[PDB]
Design a protein around this ligand. Structure first.
Ligand SMILES: Cc1ncc(C[n+]2csc(CCOP(=O)(O)OP(=O)(O)O)c2C)c(N)n1
Ligand SMILES: Cc1ncc(C[n+]2csc(CCOP(=O)(O)OP(=O)(O)O)c2C)c(N)n1
Ligand SMILES: O=C(CO)[C@@H](O)[C@H](O)COP(=O)(O)O
Ligand SMILES: O=C(CO)[C@@H](O)[C@H](O)COP(=O)(O)O
Ligand SMILES: [Ca+2]
Ligand SMILES: [Ca+2]
Lengths: 676, 676
């Protein structure tokens, strides 16, 4: 219609003008996708004034560099984002950053831009929706029936992470996921003929996706809407809608890679506007008829949400227990005193691997906290991430699980597991979700892990086999750089618990988290229960395990090296050296403590030696000398590897004694002191 | 035949016995794949006594946990690996580590185990072979005509990196790549029905691969050999051979996930041996008839290599220039004085972004060093990785390039680009190959990058847009943790050149490298030519740029922050503070210098402040105080971001002055000093 065309032109020109004002950014895909964005948002249920409505449809822009398009949609629909914000596109401190950030942009469900992530986030949103609906929906009470709409480009389809997630989403028959491929035959290097000639459609059919092809997505918004209708009929397959578009549609440079990621020339913008009936002298024009048309859809959606609120109230009357649970989750609140389920240990209990302590924690807290779900990337019997008696998340048609299940079989797909976890957290409803693999292969998922931190999502990696302690699998499996990498990433809690109490503290942090992803570095090998550990002390991230007034040295250690440090203390005593021991199960949590608390753990006037069997990077924040492993490991029985590298009570004692001698007659201040 | 069956049983039992002796490891896939390994090695051309013969067929075990199978093959064929080594499987210091390592295992082309890597390495070996053959082959001189055989499992097929590489390998029509899928319907979590139900075959057809299906790969070695013959007829498609096998074939626990990764029970091993005609009381049995049969094939292969050597000698007679070039490369030697092509700059030259300096270096050295090839992951016009006038590596049938081309269009496939680079280096012939992306997205390829370091491959990442200096794309694009991560990985040179001379030094290191991967962290933004820089000094990794006898402080910086440090020196002079400046373009290279050299750069008795606009991790090796960025970045014009975070001459000067005050009346020793 005339107003549809005008809306599409408005979107296109807002995006182009935003890029022009910044003299930076990507106008091509916004021009090519504005018809589809118009059609999809008209089909979506959402409330610009309540971005957290749990039964909203979700939209994810996986091709995040097209975000001038997303921002234009959000402005036009009256989210908390204005034309003045668009005018500050890509400007320092603005609400319109160069790639969409869920923490900064109202209506941005996730942080995208790194290619491949958004579509996987969409799989996770759709996974959560299916699980949520199976958990809460009752006859006559469709509490959850929302869709997940994803836009993606060729770039996302080239990134392996999207293949992983698309395979898994097809396997999981996620019929409320509808993704749209911007099939514009152009990427940054030029035509896709130079690097991307696969039959995408045949590939997606091989995953079990439904396909709808829209041959003229530059203009045929009727076919785009019909493709959504068709997709919604196919309740047991995610759908890929092939949008054949011209990148930069309308531009003089349409269909060229130059329109991909540079501002258009001024004269190009003038002819765009004139051909579409706009004033070439005007920027950021918003015809009131477009606002009005969009406001009609908002009003209708707000009435749908109003009715949903009444449906929820009637739900709480009919299903008081489920209803109260749901309200609690939508309030962002864990069950009262849920943490009384955390296992507690004493020094009289047996040695246990922290992977096994983790299993035991999950077995106790999963029954108490329904919003915990999680899985493993094909390492369930090694990470120990499933609680006996839970059922797998599977479409019931397979006979292998149900959508009400709580345990996800991710397969050998660490990267997509990371990004799917981000989408599950993004869904909301207080989901506290986790994913298991070996610590060394969390690195396969770095692209997503970093976005967990940037997005402030409380996801949890259950990262077992944390060190040379795993033994025979050898240096291809043994972390060296991994903790340093993730500790150097802002906003990642990297817990390396030493024993049962510390593992309960780690999970207490990970589950209570609302804005910080967690990585739990867990052992293959057994560790003793420590004298002096508790959930309370370990919850401070770092704490004095063995207090030694008159210490000649303090040894600060994590995980499996805390027990080693305690054994070294006994060797040192025989050498006439008095040591204290600090356990530092999470450096981030410790960092957040008060300066006085931190100085009580790492005081002035005593040399401090760190001990952790991987990179020494970062450890100078907490120590004067560092005993770590800065070379790759070895394939052998773990105790022999530790002996080889002198991570023995005697080897630690030797380096502690050298540290005491090194600082003899020097003044020593806490590593916590800084010049600035 | 009878001896074929006996060889297959020998292989199976060597593998099972190796796992049994270690009481650790994976017997299931070795049992299921021994028939195929027997058939493939019989088709392969190789010399156990010359593992570097450049026209050998290559074999890659992508499912590296099956390496008891690889080791058994290598022992049986008389590589420098014995039955005594097998008996030390997974034992500290042995030549039979738990996953195959090219540095430790004769006949292991690459380091595998991390799933997905090997098949991508195979794509790279096959890419190099195609390029090598196109470069050197002449009529009547098939210098290079070898195949690349890869075994892989379901796990590798689930990992996104293999999808990337398989898409690209199909695009590249790599007809000498033959991969074999162990289709045994089992992974660690159980049946593949729980997580991996895609139509693998249809997917591979969608990439343009040829398919051969072997329905009984437990016994039909005739069909496996015929599938190789068929694959070799299809010269314009890589082939996937579907091997339908029983995991753990023969074991009481065959076809169960328990046979995947745990030693078999002793009684199981007894019945294996009895059913196949072996002595259940005997371990590591090697029937001499199997040795003999295998030695016949070796002798035939050695005669093929002998004839190849004569073909090469005749080649050098007919094509003296090409022949001498080829001999030089097979000797591992760069062209004499190739480095005289490196650009050199003075302080009178204009400011240049180090990405552009990189382009200029490549434009000068590519014509001089034919063994340089490389590409970009769809960022060619942003990384600036193509030299004008080179042609792309493409099958000529596309019209878009030729296999003699030297520039690879990797598409948006960073992880596979990493692992393909490892395979290109693994091919040998002195290939010095590179791959461009933004530094922040090198992290997508961490799984492969770590294996570059562990494998000692001289690959090069051309990693542009290294910091907040890139500006508007914002925090999803700006590295914070990235250098710390890779610097904390053993054996990665992480060059962050400050100017033209330093960028030439970085490439001199990267191209001369034979055992160390390089990451070149390069700027989007322009940087000045520094007074005091040179290729000679920067080649030391760290060097005194501005010497100040009587320094009150030394500022050590890298890349874009070296110019900042020099500007801070001028501010400090006005505040009555004398500073020196150290440039540290590669910490690893610097670390390898003599202790006296390093102390001349970072002396005792002077506080040292580091300045680098990302994580402060690692910097305490070189400084007393660290000025870095330990939070995510921001979307804005780069100079405004630097101002926001006070990476300005005044902000650096302020922190330098606080550092001088902090150490007033303290004794200061070089950060290079250690207690142990
Ligand atoms: C993981 C990752 N790699 C590389 C980039 C850089 N990049 C942004 S867009 C883009 C091109 C992808 O092309 P396409 O998705 O087809 O976008 P279109 O040009 O059609 O808008 C690339 C390589 C990125 N943002 N993330
Ligand atoms: C990147 C990566 N993720 C996880 C692992 C752990 N792992 C080793 S084998 C394996 C199972 C893969 O199953 P499959 O390849 O089908 O091997 P099969 O059991 O049939 O021998 C897993 C998950 C790994 N080695 N590398
Ligand atoms: O080794 C691998 C990865 O290649 C897995 O098969 C697990 O390592 C199984 O062993 P556990 O450590 O769980 O006992
Ligand atoms: O921004 C992206 C990645 O999303 C690319 O489109 C490049 O950033 C293009 O800009 P230059 O920095 O090369 O000028
Ligand atoms: Ca495209
Ligand atoms: Ca399998």
């Amino acid at each position: 219609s005339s107003v549809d065309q005008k809306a599409i032109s408005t979107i296109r020109l807002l995006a182009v003008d935003a890029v022009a004002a910044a003299n930076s950014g990507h106008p091509g895909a916004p021009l090519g996708l504005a018809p589809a964005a118009h059609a999809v948002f008209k089909k979506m249920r959402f409330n610009p004034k309540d971005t957290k409505w749990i039964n909203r449809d979700r939209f994810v822009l996986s091709n995040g560099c097209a975000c001038a398009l997303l921002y234009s949609m959000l402005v036009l629909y009256g989210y908390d984002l204005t034309v003045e914000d668009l005018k500050k596109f890509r400007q320092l401190g603005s609400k319109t950053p160069g790639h969409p950030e869920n923490t900064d942009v109202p209506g941005a469900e996730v942080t995208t831009g790194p290619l491949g992530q958004g579509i996987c986030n969409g799989v996770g949103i759709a996974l959560a929706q299916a699980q949520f609906a199976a958990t809460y929906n009752k006859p006559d009470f469709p509490i959850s029936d929302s869709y997940t709409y994803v836009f993606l480009g060729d770039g996302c389809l080239m990134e392996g992470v999207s293949s992983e997630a698309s395979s898994l989403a097809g396997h999981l028959q996620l019929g409320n996921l509808i993704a749209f491929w911007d099939d514009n035959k152009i990427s940054i290097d030029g035509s896709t003929e130079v690097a991307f000639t696969e039959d995408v459609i045949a590939r997606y059919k091989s995953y079990g996706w439904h396909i709808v092809e829209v041959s003229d997505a530059d203009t045929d918004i009727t076919a785009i809407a019909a493709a959504i209708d068709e997709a919604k009929k196919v309740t047991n397959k995610p759908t890929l809608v092939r949008l054949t578009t011209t990148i930069g549609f309308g531009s003089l440079a349409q269909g060229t890679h130059g329109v991909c990621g540079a501002p258009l020339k001024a004269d190009d913008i003038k002819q765009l506007k004139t051909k579409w009936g706009f004033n070439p002298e005007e920027s950021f024009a918003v015809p009131a008829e477009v606002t009005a048309s969009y406001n009609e859809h908002v009003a209708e959606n707000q009435k749908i949400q109003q009715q949903w609120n009444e449906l929820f109230a009637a739900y709480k009357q009919k299903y008081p227990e489920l209803g109260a649970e749901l309200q609690r989750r939508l309030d962002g609140k864990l069950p009262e005193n849920w943490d009384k389920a955390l296992p507690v240990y004493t020094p009289a209990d047996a040695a246990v691997a922290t992977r096994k302590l983790s299993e035991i924690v999950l077995s106790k807290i999963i029954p108490e906290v329904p919003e915990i779900i999680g899985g493993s990337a094909d390492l369930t019997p090694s990470n120990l991430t499933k609680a006996k008696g839970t059922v797998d998340f599977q479409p019931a048609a397979t006979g292998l699980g149900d959508y009400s299940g709580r345990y996800i079989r991710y397969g050998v797909r660490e990267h997509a597991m990371g990004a799917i976890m981000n989408g599950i957290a993004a869904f909301g409803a207080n989901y506290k979700n986790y994913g298991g693999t070996f610590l060394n292969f969390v690195s396969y998922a770095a692209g997503a892990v970093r976005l967990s931190a940037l997005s402030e999502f409380p996801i949890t990696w259950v990262a077992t086999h944390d060190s040379i302690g795993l033994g025979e699998d050898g240096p291809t499996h043994q972390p060296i750089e991994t903790l340093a990498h993730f500790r150097a990433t802002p906003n990642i809690s990297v817990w390396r618990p030493a024993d049962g109490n510390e593992t309960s503290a780690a999970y207490k942090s990970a589950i209570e988290s609302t804005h910080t992803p967690h990585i739990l570095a867990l052992t293959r090998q057994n560790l003793p229960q420590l004298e002096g550990s508790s959930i309370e002390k370990a919850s401070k991230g770092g704490y004095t395990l063995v207090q030694q007034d008159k210490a000649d040295i303090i040894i600060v250690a994590t995980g499996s090296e805390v027990s080693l440090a305690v054994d070294a203390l006994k060797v040192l005593e025989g050498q006439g050296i008095k040591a204290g021991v600090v356990s530092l199960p999470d450096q981030l949590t410790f960092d957040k403590q008060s300066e006085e608390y931190k100085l009580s753990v790492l005081p002035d006037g005593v040399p401090i030696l760190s001990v952790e069997v991987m990179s020494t990077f970062g450890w100078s924040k907490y120590s004067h000398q560092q005993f770590g492993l800065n070379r790759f490991g070895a394939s052998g029985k773990a105790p022999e590897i530790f002996k080889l590298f002198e991570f023995t009570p005697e080897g630690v004692a030797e380096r502690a004694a050298k540290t005491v001698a090194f600082y003899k007659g020097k003044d020593v201040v806490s590593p916590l002191r800084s010049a600035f």
